[PDB]
Design a protein around this ligand. Structure first.
Ligand code: COA
Ligand code: COA
Lengths: 327, 327
């Protein structure tokens, strides 16, 4: 009797430190307006001393739970898509569920850079539909602690945020997730990478500091690959839902880079004016950007029944995905 | 038309270094037979220098694909449950799918300690039944590079392995995953932990080497909490599937500790003779244990149609789960 899922509540959260382009442009010896011109970012939020991923996730999640007016017993599963868990062990999701008082909820972390939220959304939808119970989906990242301040290509982009969606079970068809496409291309695995800390190079006393920090080895190759993945996944979820770009009420791409957002919009023939854009104030927080944008646009104009959303993302891996969701 | 998933193929792999109890006992200044008395482990496999998580996972994955006689184009999604990815970024799953030639497969890492494979299995079953496409589920860990060699409670248990299962879409009902129950208990989050490395304490020059390695802070408390979670999840999936333990053909618990496996069997009324037990040769490899045991038990005696499998695990988090699968 459950045939679909709906986004019943939305939330998002950022740390308090607001970091303008001008502060970063000073550190990197760049003139004024350099960052905004090349990325569309004007400011971003960065975590401060102590700030935890789970505490950030918790605030977005609590906001989404309260928005859904759902009792906390109703959450059967908590999916936390993150690249930056509190600890390498255990995963952060069980602590997130505990801090939200979700006493009947399972919990697991998903590592998909971003593409993590779209993967988590798709699998959560399949859970909601298979078991007929609600799932909380949170995406959150503290990328600021992974930024190599000397690497301009990354230092000007990445930001910290959390977004959350509550998925509840629905009895009716031809709504909810109409189509979904999840791709991966490991030929680009080394383009966005942290050298040290996995099992391939465990962290050791006296290792090179920067080996713990993100690097983007070829910013232009990544741009081209990411645009192709978001374009191609979007085109085929549209084809599978039997829609065109003209039927999408709101386009919510991963907020990698405004120039990249524009490129995808062009490739798909989607007006700039239908595209949710939050990178300007929140930067690129990887898997958090799409649920943060959904929280933002829903606050600005509540999502109305019959609206169709197109969500797409691409990330390190490489990974990519798209989802057509109908309110 | 798809109404269930079937485990169409199995695989497992381990590294080449065999570590007898005697070598670790000497290390810890322990009398002979100490480890086997208390854990039932006789030996375990550890990684050698240059071995990689993704390479280990690939060997298990390929054995599972070949056992399934499945064309690589059919794999639409690769789920890698690991705590020990090659790199902190990107996830290891896209590389694994790339090295296995799965050119149509998405890919994402799940981090669930363990419980990771049972979460992976549950969500993949939802994917299979929702989209009608095959999924490769791998669980793999190289815990040895995270072992604190001085900590007796963890150094004698943990091991390296990979296990893999090909889930294919099946038209018929009343088989496959009959019930699943996924739980989390974050009040025990600190019991099994790595201090440094996540976003809470990022890795730094000059930091205490110890902080990069696992610690189990209260083994007795872990033992009780994990036994309870495996017992309680197992009872409720049996109740949901309207089966008794006597209907279960093979019981396949997470291989944490033979004494813990004995305690769960004892609570549930399950014969030692029905329990798959691989911990004696393969140790505790977290999420890899259950699919490794499934591949072992299937090699010894092919899973026959009609057989009913009870799977259960608990882990750091706390996390836990149970699955009833009918062949
Ligand atoms: C566009 C992108 C490169 C972002 O980085 P960026 O803001 O452009 O930063 P860059 O320094 O690389 O931009 C190019 C700049 O370097 C300069 N530059 C680089 N190589 C140069 C060269 N060989 N000669 C001259 N100038 C060069 C460019 O000309 C330009 O600076 P300048 O005009 O002042 O000389 C892109 O990779 C991106 O946005 N990726 C998204 C991050 C991510 O992973 N998101 C997840 C989804 S993809
Ligand atoms: C059983 C468990 C405690 C670890 O295994 P273990 O080898 O039995 O751990 P211990 O070393 O504490 O066993 C008792 C021993 O510790 C010794 N010990 C520990 N602290 C001691 C102390 N303060 N004083 C005296 N002895 C002490 C006991 O005397 C006994 O040692 P001895 O027989 O040589 O004298 C348990 O935590 C476990 O196995 N957990 C599973 C691992 C896991 O996380 N699996 C994933 C699913 S949970």
């Amino acid at each position: 009797q459950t045939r679909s899922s709906r986004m019943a509540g939305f939330g998002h959260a950022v740390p308090a430190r607001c970091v303008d382009n001008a502060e970063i442009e000073a550190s990197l010896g760049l003139e004024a307006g350099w960052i905004e011109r090349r990325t569309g970012i004007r400011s971003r939020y960065w975590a401060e001393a102590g700030d935890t991923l789970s505490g950030l996730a918790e605030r977005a999640g609590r906001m989404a739970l309260e928005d859904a007016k759902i009792n906390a017993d109703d959450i059967a599963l908590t999916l936390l898509a993150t690249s930056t868990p509190d600890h390498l062990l255990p995963p952060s999701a069980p602590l997130l569920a505990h801090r939200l008082g979700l006493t009947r909820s399972g919990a697991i972390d998903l590592a998909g850079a971003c593409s993590g939220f779209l993967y988590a959304l798709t699998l959560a939808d399949g859970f909601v539909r298979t078991y007929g119970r609600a799932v909380l989906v949170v995406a959150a990242n503290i990328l600021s602690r992974r930024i190599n301040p000397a690497e301009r290509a990354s230092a000007v982009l990445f930001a910290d945020a959390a977004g959350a969606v509550v998925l509840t079970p629905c009895p009716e068809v031809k709504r909810g997730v109409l189509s979904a496409d999840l791709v991966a291309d490991g030929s680009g695995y080394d383009l966005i990478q942290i050298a040290a800390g996995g099992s391939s190079q465990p962290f050791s006393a006296g290792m090179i500091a920067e080996d713990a920090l993100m690097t983007m080895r070829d910013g232009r190759e990544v741009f081209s690959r990411a645009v192709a993945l978001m374009t191609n996944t979007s085109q085929r979820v549209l084809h599978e839902a039997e829609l065109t770009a003209a039927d999408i009420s709101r386009f919510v791409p991963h907020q990698a880079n405004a120039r990249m957002s524009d490129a995808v919009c062009g490739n798909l023939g989607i007006e700039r004016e239908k595209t949710v854009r939050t990178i300007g104030s929140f930067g690129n927080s990887s898997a958090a950007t799409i649920p943060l944008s959904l929280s933002i646009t829903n606050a600005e104009r509540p999502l109305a029944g019959g609206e169709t959303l197109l969500l797409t993302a691409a990330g390190a891996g490489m990974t990519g995905g798209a989802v057509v969701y109908r309110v």
